[PDB]
Design a protein around this ligand. Sequence first.
Ligand SMILES: Nc1ncnc2c1ncn2[C@@H]1O[C@H](COP(=O)(O)OP(=O)(O)OP(=O)(O)O)[C@@H](O)[C@H]1O
Ligand SMILES: [Mg+2]
Lengths: 218, 239, 240, 232, 233, 233, 247, 229
Amino acid sequence: GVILYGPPGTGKTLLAKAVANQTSATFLRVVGSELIQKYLGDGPKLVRELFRVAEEHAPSIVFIDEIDAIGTKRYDSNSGGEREIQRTMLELLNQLDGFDSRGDVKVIMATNRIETLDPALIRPGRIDRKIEFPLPDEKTKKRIFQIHTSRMTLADDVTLDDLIMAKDDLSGADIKAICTEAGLMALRERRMKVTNEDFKKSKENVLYKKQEGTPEGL
Amino acid sequence: GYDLSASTFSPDGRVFQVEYAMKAVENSSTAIGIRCKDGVVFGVEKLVLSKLYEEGSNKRLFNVDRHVGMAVAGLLADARSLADIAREEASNFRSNFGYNIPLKHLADRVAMYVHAYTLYSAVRPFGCSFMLGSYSVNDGAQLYMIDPSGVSYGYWGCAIGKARQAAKTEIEKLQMKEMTCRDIVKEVAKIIYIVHDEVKDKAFELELSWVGELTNGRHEIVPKDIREEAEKYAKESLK
Amino acid sequence: RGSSAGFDRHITIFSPEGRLYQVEYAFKAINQGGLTSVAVRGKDCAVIVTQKKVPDKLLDSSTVTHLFKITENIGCVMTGMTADSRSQVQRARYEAANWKYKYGYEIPVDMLCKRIADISQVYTQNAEMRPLGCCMILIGIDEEQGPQVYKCDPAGYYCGFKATAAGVKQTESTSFLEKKVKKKFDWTFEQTVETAITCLSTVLSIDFKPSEIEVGVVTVENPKFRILTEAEIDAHLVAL
Amino acid sequence: SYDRAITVFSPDGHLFQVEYAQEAVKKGSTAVGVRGRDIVVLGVEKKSVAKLQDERTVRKICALDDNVCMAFAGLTADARIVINRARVECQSHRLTVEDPVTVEYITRYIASLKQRYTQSNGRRPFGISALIVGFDFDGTPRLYQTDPSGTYHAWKANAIGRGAKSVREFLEKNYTDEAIETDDLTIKLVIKALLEVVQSGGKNIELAVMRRDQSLKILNPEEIEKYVAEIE
Amino acid sequence: YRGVNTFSPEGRLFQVEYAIEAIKLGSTAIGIQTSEGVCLAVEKRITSPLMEPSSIEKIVEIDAHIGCAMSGLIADAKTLIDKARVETQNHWFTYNETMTVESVTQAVSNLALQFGEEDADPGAMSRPFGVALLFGGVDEKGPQLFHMDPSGTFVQCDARAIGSASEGAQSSLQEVYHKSMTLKEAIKSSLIILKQVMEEKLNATNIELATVQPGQNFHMFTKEELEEVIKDI
Amino acid sequence: NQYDNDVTVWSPQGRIHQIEYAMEAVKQGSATVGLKSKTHAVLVALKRAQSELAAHQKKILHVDNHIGISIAGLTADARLLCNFMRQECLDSRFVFDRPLPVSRLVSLIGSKTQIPTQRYGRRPYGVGLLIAGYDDMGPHIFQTCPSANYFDCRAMSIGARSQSARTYLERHMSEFMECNLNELVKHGLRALRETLPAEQDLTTKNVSIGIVGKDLEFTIYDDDDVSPFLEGL
Amino acid sequence: SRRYDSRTTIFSPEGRLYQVEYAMEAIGHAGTCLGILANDGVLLAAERRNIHKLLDEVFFSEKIYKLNEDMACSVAGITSDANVLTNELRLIAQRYLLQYQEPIPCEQLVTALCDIKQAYTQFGGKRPFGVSLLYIGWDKHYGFQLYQSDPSGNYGGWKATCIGNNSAAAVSMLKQDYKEGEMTLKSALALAIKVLNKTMDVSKLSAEKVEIATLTRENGKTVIRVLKQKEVEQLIKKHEEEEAKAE
Amino acid sequence: RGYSFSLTTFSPSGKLVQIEYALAAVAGGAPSVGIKAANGVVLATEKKQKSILYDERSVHKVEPITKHIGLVYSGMGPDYRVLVHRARKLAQQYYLVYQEPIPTAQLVQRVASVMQEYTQSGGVRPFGVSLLICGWNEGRPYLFQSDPSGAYFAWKATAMGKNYVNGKTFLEKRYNEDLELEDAIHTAILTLKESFEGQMTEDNIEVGICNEAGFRRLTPTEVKDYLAA
Ligand SMILES: Nc1ncnc2c1ncn2[C@@H]1O[C@H](COP(=O)(O)OP(=O)(O)OP(=O)(O)O)[C@@H](O)[C@H]1O
Ligand SMILES: [Mg+2]
């Protein structure tokens, strides 16, 4: 199996969807928050049935997005739904590698936060490959900007290089939001083309969502 | 988690840490003490954990003062610490006021010292019960007992340890208010043998002490000859 | 109503509603002893009466007592945990002696209750130690105020009183005394002892004999605190 | 007196409070220092001028004495406390030994202070790493680095703070006797290394230069821009 | 939770066990005792080429006749070394003699494990020291080698290896060491083992070697001497 | 699992787990035996070495001219207790110019060791002792526990696999009073031998003996000094 | 006891001081305080958070405190904690005057207080002072000055800054419309009114929710004044007119 | 020995919950009122005992501090006594140094600093009590409030305790700048009457005033007196 880990907004789900659409096998997607059921045993039953209808469908790919919800360090001293989440994780562990042969099923997992997962959950025999997704640096940024502005008429004054040059830890999701908001505000102003000032103001608005404390930690 | 410190009340108003301390006292071998007209007599069921121990080892009878005795049950280490405290209180009283400490006052001072250890989380309750006995012509025979909670009362015959209930039943038939120390010593030995469980515990040694007119008001170990007579009487009684 | 957040139930820190659960438990501990006491103020006397339970003949009944003499003219009765009450009695004696040494006259009953209340209040504010689970009632004759009866509790509340109870049947005794207090005077004679003994006898349904209660009184004519002997108690019991 | 053991060992033999203090150093702004033949240079990247802050009161390079200066990376308040403790010690050493402090001595003092806070009761480790540069009385240039753990070493050139791994990688390949041949060449090496991480360049970096006899000198914005222009 | 002075179910203090675990993170250090003298060797473990190897001091001199090799949390050992130096000079000042190696080890070991949280001191140590020390020197009894652990336990040893490669370094020392070994053989054997365990290639700049002999004082080999020995090794 | 993390926390069964664990530390220690006769008190201990090239850890220490101890447990705590005992013996000689009676020395130990077992943040002393001494009342053998309790014995053994030794001492207890010094020591060695794990024999490198008598100040025999006693067993 | 201890002076897994972070988040809600440095003076403008028909007017101000003959400060956060720090500031400044017989320079006074705050965040087991302060003053070394401090014990000099509610918008506006090196006390006052007008979304400037203090040098002596109601209203009216004329 | 760590700590959103709960205890306390007239101040409180047995005159809620300062509370009674003792101690310390009665503002500041210390010191909880302090200094009346957090405010009229929201809304409608002490006393009694749940008697409430003559607690004769109107 493969686990995709990286900071939030780098393209884990994007790559999973791309392989899903480009592959010839039954692709199944489940978000970890959907395995936190409200009745005892239903999380384990859901994982059991998810892997049950994955051998019934020939080659298959089971992509459990946001595993961090169900998988965790597994601290014994906890009470409440933590025990049920742990039992769901144990059932998933057994399905991934246990007494029975797994047939022909491939597992993909994505997690913004991999350090809090269970070593038993991401041990080699369970997940072999571990792919790191880094934040775009200098030219991947230009590529995403072009890709997301492809179907959008732009005026001949767009300094995309000026937009990307800043070392603002910008993410691909941030770039997509920038493009969408720039288009939206052009539409609001009634214009027929997006302007460099529109892009700059959209970028400033997007980066306004930072928060935190300045002196703290630095 | 209401029973993890002595500085927290339970929902119903109980200090479980103190209660557990008494529970430890309830696992020790029984020790009894009977007050009579002439004086006071103490007796202890000392189990022989190993045959390699010397006779008199881990003695559970102490002389806190030249006129005051002390019998203990429970954790021995805590008991010895309290005996040192009682000696300190008795010595300090004589230096300050110039005469032997009354037994009632000595019991009160030690009880308050014990009670001070059931109010804070920085210390734990003494896991031991003990009894103080003395005799003076002016005050007569006096016997007291103190528990982990720090409560002290006067008694005519007291028991502490494993077989507290059985010993109390036996003590009820003695009619100690009009008996002498010589006769009481035999009775104290008899009771200890009856309450003891030979099936459970392997063997025990009987430790005896007394204080009264016959000893001139000084607590001391019972003479070997008298102890031998008392042991023979108790064994003969157990037909 | 009973929400909890953190250690409000383990130490003396405010509950979400603004409660001190540990203080409340100290009140609940006062009823562990199983005893009840009553104090009633007369026209020119004060009387305190409490139960006396000797579980077996082996106990020396003489030492089993809940009435104490704080000073020559002040006496008290304690309820709740035995060890806690004795420690508070020692502190009251020390405080009264200190007052006499420092200011040159005997400590008024209200001031003694106030001093003990202040000491208790420290326990409920500081988290290092639990509150004493015991209650004190003080009786004495004031120079220009007649008889006095005061009561202080674990929290530090120390209001004065005309009639009072404490223990298992505090509620029933309080109602009984209030009814009597409402009628004419809650007794206005040295036979105020009869009112107290009747109040205690009524709630517990005991029909006391001479060796099941202890009485302590102070009178204007004889301000010294005294403990009535079993003979005198029997005389009052037969009269009623 | 609060006397709890803040710093204690953990399974596998780790001091999490020390490691957390290190991740606190890593969040700070980048700082670079190189030891030249007859000059020691300290550089630091400014997160943002803000156009409103008074730059005089936000200096991350401070002079411990006439012959020693340091730059830190981590909690600003913690650094100010450590800097003051070093300053009093430098004067105290002058008073007793009657000679100026050596860079190794003051580095040892600061490191011992940091180590003490990792083993004391009721105390938090210092969340800063310092680069101390200066000239010994013999005239040999010196450059030292201290970590929150209390360890210190002597470096030809090192970087601390955010993105320190890349700057250190750049310095390792680009440090040579030829590069430090001249004082101007040494300064350009620091500027180029900083430009590896910081974006704007020139307007986002502060530089301090210490020579053998001359005291600490802070390069003016015009001088920094000229060096940046020469670099490109 | 889990105060520093806590006992595990097997009777082993948690903090001491963790401190001993911290020793395995240190670089390897070897010490051999011979009738001719005592030699100490330690891998410097240079992290990056820009660091100056001369500033890594894992072998220090306590007195003219005592030397110490350190492994573990090197910052912790600074206080232990300072105590040893002060104790040695106090003994000379009082008795006008030189402390024995065992007495110096004993004084340092007593300092270790004197940590506490409640009713100890205004600023007492909160944790044990995470360093294992090898004391080498020559006393009235001749060459002496002592090993001290974080648990405050010290013992004389003919040859002892500590650090990340202690298991395997000790194995080699077992096969080679013998009582009649000379100082030259001891230095060669120590270097051979160090070269084997070290991940990096052994050279004159990334290791430290010192010796103490009945005649000469504590001596730390310079580069020229180090190059000579490794050439044969 | 919440009543075994502090020494001031009673458990529901009226037991303090922390004290129980400290008692478990001395069990992991190495074996040691102590017996007495009408004239002499003897201590024999089995020393063990961490490695083949490390000296065997010493187990018998001096306290005064008439008192000695054998330790089994945490050595650092043993040195702290031994230091306390030596000071108490010294103070008695300084003030009263008289040896401190053994029983009174043991009572002082119990008082000191009890305090940690009742205060928050403190721990019991993780060491057991076998005190052998001679006073005006004759030979004495005492046993101390991490719980501040002591027993006046006539023959006792503590440490790992010490039950086999205690079995021997009880079987032959009737002979110790009237045997000579050579016979008494052999009895101590035979018991220690029983503790040994089958395929192993007592050796001059792992056996240490301590003797105190009516006209014999406390002495410790180690190395070749033990050969006269071993010859004959 | 270890169980009940909060551990207010430890590091988080990502090397963060949570108690300091929370304390700063507490200041984020308090009344807005504004400081502007001009060529011939400094000023402090603070939102008078307490507003009730029954509150009486006592003292010369509610949030502006005088520290020396040539210094003053405003606070934002826990009022009780602020009173503790303002008293310490007065003591520190007088101790310096006693030692040197010269008024304490403004930068030194800020550093002395920030040292106290830093100690609270490092050792002691106590909660940090949940207060942030703005200082204005004059000294012979650097003339008019304006400083800011945070619970962490960190401070910095500013030409114009804000802390409290809607600080982000306030600083964003100040950054845009601040003419460094060419601002008089009169344009500074007008800028303060405009910033306060938008920052306090609730209602508008009533001349009762605003307290303004200005520091200037007259005849060689520092003068600290709190603007009266008549002049504060006059400023608001002028701001209203200018806003009207623009539209 | 005593815990050295603060029990009051910042919450994730920046609130001091322990101070929040101390105010909740004050809120559930007994109602209190204070009105600053043109020539004096008045403090009033409800003193509803639990039954006929309690002695109404045994313990007072309106306790003087000096010849010109008095205060009342709403919250826990035991905590009020501690602060009253500290307040009297501070007033005398001031007088010893300056040979002048402590001004009302100064006393409030010092008392407030004491309450603040219990929100930061180690092993203590906040005073679950709010104080109202009245004074007459420099020919002017003063009325102050001091909360558990240690913050103090100057009031022309205010109320605390149960249903203090309605009490303040009531006071706002009825207040007037030029009131007279007699009208202030009458309004103060009525404010309490708003939420009293029973018949108000001279034994069921307590009143005190402060003016040029000085602070003094009104006798039950006068309290009944005013009640009649
Ligand atoms: N390299 C990229 N190329 C194109 N689009 C990208 C890239 N990186 C991110 N995006 C955009 O990011 C948006 C957010 O979804 P994405 O799959 O990237 O999230 P993610 O990395 O899985 O994040 P999370 O960890 O929060 O689940 C996608 O719609 C995609 O448009
Ligand atoms: Mg995703």
